[PDB]
Paper text:
Initial co-crystallization trials in search for diffraction quality crystals of avidin in complex with B9P failed to yield single crystals. Thus, the streak seeding method was used to obtain single crystals of the avidin/B9P complex. The crystals belong to the orthorhombic space group P212121, with the unit-cell parameters a = 57.16, b = 81.95, and c = 107.89 for avidin/B9P and a = 58.97, b = 81.52, and c = 107.78 for avidin/D9P. The final models of the avidin/B9P and avidin/D9P complexes were refined to resolutions of 2.0 Å and 2.1 Å, respectively. The B9P molecule consists of the ureido ring, tetrahydrothiophene ring, valeric acid, and the pyrene moiety, while D9P molecule includes the methyl group and methylene bridge instead of the tetrahydrothiophene ring. The binding cavity in each subunit of avidin is occupied by a single ligand molecule with the same orientation, with the ring system of biotin and desthiobiotin moieties hidden deeply inside the β-barrel, while the pyrene moiety is located at the barrel entrance. The sulfur atom from the tetrahydrothiophene ring of B9P acts as an acceptor for the hydroxyl group of Thr77, while in the case of D9P there is no equivalent interaction. The fluorescence maximum was shifted to 425 nm upon the binding of B9P to avidin. The hypsochromic shift of the fluorescence maximum upon avidin/B9P complex creation may indicate that the avidin binding loops in the area of pyrene are less polar than the bulk solvent. Interestingly, we found that the crystal of avidin/B9P complex exhibited pink fluorescence upon excitation by a strong synchrotron X-ray beam during diffraction data collection.
Author numbering:
A (entry chain B), C (entry chain C): 2 to 123
B (entry chain A): 3 to 123
D (entry chain D): 2 to 124
The structure:
Amino acid sequence: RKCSLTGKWTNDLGSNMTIGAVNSRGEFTGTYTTAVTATSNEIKESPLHGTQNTINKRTQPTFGFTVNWKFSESTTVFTGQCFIDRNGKEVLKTMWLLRSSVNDIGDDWKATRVGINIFTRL
Amino acid sequence: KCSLTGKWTNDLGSNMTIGAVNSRGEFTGTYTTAVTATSNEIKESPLHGTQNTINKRTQPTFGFTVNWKFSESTTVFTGQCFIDRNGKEVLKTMWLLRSSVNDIGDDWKATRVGINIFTRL
Amino acid sequence: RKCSLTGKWTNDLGSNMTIGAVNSRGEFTGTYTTAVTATSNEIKESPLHGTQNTINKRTQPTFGFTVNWKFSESTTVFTGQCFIDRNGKEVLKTMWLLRSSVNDIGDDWKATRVGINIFTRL
Amino acid sequence: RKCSLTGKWTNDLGSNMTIGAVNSRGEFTGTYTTAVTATSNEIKESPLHGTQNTINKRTQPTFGFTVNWKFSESTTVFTGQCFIDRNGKEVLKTMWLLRSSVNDIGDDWKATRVGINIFTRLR
Ligand SMILES: O=C1N[C@H]2[C@H](CS[C@H]2CCCCC(=O)c2ccc3ccc4cccc5ccc2c3c45)N1
Ligand SMILES: O=C1N[C@H]2[C@H](CS[C@H]2CCCCC(=O)c2ccc3ccc4cccc5ccc2c3c45)N1
Ligand SMILES: O=C1N[C@H]2[C@H](CS[C@H]2CCCCC(=O)c2ccc3ccc4cccc5ccc2c3c45)N1
Ligand SMILES: O=C1N[C@H]2[C@H](CS[C@H]2CCCCC(=O)c2ccc3ccc4cccc5ccc2c3c45)N1
Ligand SMILES: *[C@@H]1O[C@H](CO)[C@@H](O)[C@H](O)[C@H]1NC(C)=O
Ligand SMILES: *[C@@H]1O[C@H](CO)[C@@H](O)[C@H](O)[C@H]1NC(C)=O
Ligand SMILES: *[C@@H]1O[C@H](CO)[C@@H](O)[C@H](O)[C@H]1NC(C)=O
Ligand SMILES: *[C@@H]1O[C@H](CO)[C@@H](O)[C@H](O)[C@H]1NC(C)=O
């Protein structure tokens, strides 16, 4: 069918996320449980909010979301595309930017990390 | 505090308006790009995001998604709101622009990266 | 047993590269055969030039290199780190930037793609 | 007529680099003096090695180089294009990846930072 974002996912790093119903404007909300973190602070489940692109109602749509971490001053944004193979196996191929907080504008240059994640269903 | 609400323009000439930021840090708005990857006519597009409220920083991090209404593509922006040495607010952001590809074997080439600096308009 | 860049490698996309000897300053040269390309033009083997970081002569050093494509106006740069496991299996975890040419500076914004690659020995 | 990498440059952060002659294969070397650093160590001038793309011998070519930092375990790679306006004013629009060292492969995910730089000539 269409590749749908709703439901439960895990990534190559062991992180989980659950996304709820996608409304008619493509808006969704959920939660994200990272399996990894940059430092010793305790991981807390964090909210995410995003949109799926609905133009031409593609069966493999692009999308993006923001994770607003509840245990860091940082923000991660993820963007990717939902693929589906002939057996109906779904996968999200994503890239992210992780923005840290810096105290001063002179340190902005070092504030942004980059990486990928591949998510498959639970 | 450096506040996301209001009207902004970037180094490329794009405009965006962000509304009120609620108690969970959620905001919505609209984005008018000045530039585009292809010939399709530009349309104003919704954005949705969140500002980080931990320690209620006067210069908080944030992120938002632009759900383009004239492309199959998605752009995500993340940055931090600074209050500059001239007293001006400025958003320093980096973005990932995801294009749609028909086949998973082409995924590798789908994601572009860049920056934008926004100032108030 | 240090993780050494010299020799023949293949990545998750099927691309091959062969790196020669790494000199005492960490400098190396080689060739890169991509398995994929952005367009229809025929792929040609292309030169690469790089450096491995030698500070503290780490057994898992960072490195970078430039691929000077011989069939495109484009350039790709890769940067990563060479890892080992105790049975001696080496792997390079890398991220790349692929710079396309544009014929007007007003189009610079779109010129740069980003991704990852994982290489293992042949 | 062509935008040439050789010579002395400075970027929006204040960093300087000097690039030497670009040979017929497009190979160059030089030195990089960052104005900024992620941590307290004293900044040391560092070698760079790169190539400019010569396909179709464009007057505004792409290029890339690696900076092998002499004061960190880290590596930076820069890639971009040399632009030249009608008065002959040159500028390098670049983007970079900064790879830090991590002790364990389980930390790889956090190792890579991203950003941009714009360089203009020093006469
Ligand atoms: O599934 C996935 N998980 C990872 C990737 C992309 S998002 C990433 C999780 C990041 C959570 C924040 C974090 O680890 C964290 C934790 C504690 C920090 C303490 C102090 C910090 C100071 C500056 C910057 C930080 C950035 C992230 C930090 C922390 C800091 N995919
Ligand atoms: O303010 C800022 N503006 C720029 C930067 C980052 S977001 C970027 C604007 C992106 C608009 C979407 C687009 O270009 C677009 C439009 C139409 C497309 C039609 C067909 C496409 C086919 C493949 C790939 C595409 C990629 C982007 C496309 C389009 C396509 N900052
Ligand atoms: O092993 C790996 N392979 C891939 C990844 C990162 S490097 C990439 C291979 C790049 C080959 C050059 C290319 O695709 C290429 C070739 C011809 C082009 C002609 C015209 C272009 C116009 C705009 C943008 C381009 C981008 C890449 C192009 C070409 C163009 N890892
Ligand atoms: O002109 C430009 N300059 C900046 C940008 C991109 S390259 C960047 C300079 C990087 C110098 C290395 C560095 O800061 C550095 C120095 C010491 C470090 C010690 C320990 C580290 C541990 C983890 C990560 C690091 C990242 C950079 C580090 C260092 C570490 N443009
Ligand atoms: C992901 O979900 C599984 C069970 O449904 C659980 O074992 C695992 O702990 C979860 N991951 C994280 C990082 O919480
Ligand atoms: C941004 O706003 C200014 C002032 O209203 C306007 O003149 C300009 O055309 C707008 N730009 C775009 C891309 O809509
Ligand atoms: C890489 O090497 C393998 C084994 O030698 C070979 O079969 C394959 O064709 C090579 N790939 C490319 C892209 O040349
Ligand atoms: C670069 O050179 C300029 C003048 O040539 C100098 O004023 C500046 O301090 C130098 N910057 C660095 C980082 O060395």
